[PDB]
Symmetry: C4
Subunit: 25 residues, 4 copies
């Protein structure tokens, strides 16, 4: 729904940032 989709997009952003931080380390 319109509420769960916004949370799903936020989870993807966190996973992408985690990968980048791991590459910089």
């Amino acid at each position: 729904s319109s509420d769960p989709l916004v949370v799903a997009a936020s989870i993807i952003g966190i996973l992408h940032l985690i990968a980048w931080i791991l590459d910089r380390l």
Copy 2:
């Protein structure tokens, strides 16, 4: 308004992350 603009900025962040994930794949 001040509430819809914050959601609009969040949607843009998710679209940008999706493109990056597609490039890495």
Copy 3:
């Protein structure tokens, strides 16, 4: 405060994504 700081960090994320989208265009 603990509520305004979370919004301030979100605004920075949107500005960073906007710059990236402008570079890709």
Copy 4:
């Protein structure tokens, strides 16, 4: 919990964006 984890992922996204902005400057 399910509420604190979502905030923790958001904090990581802000730190990653701050580093990028510092590199561009």
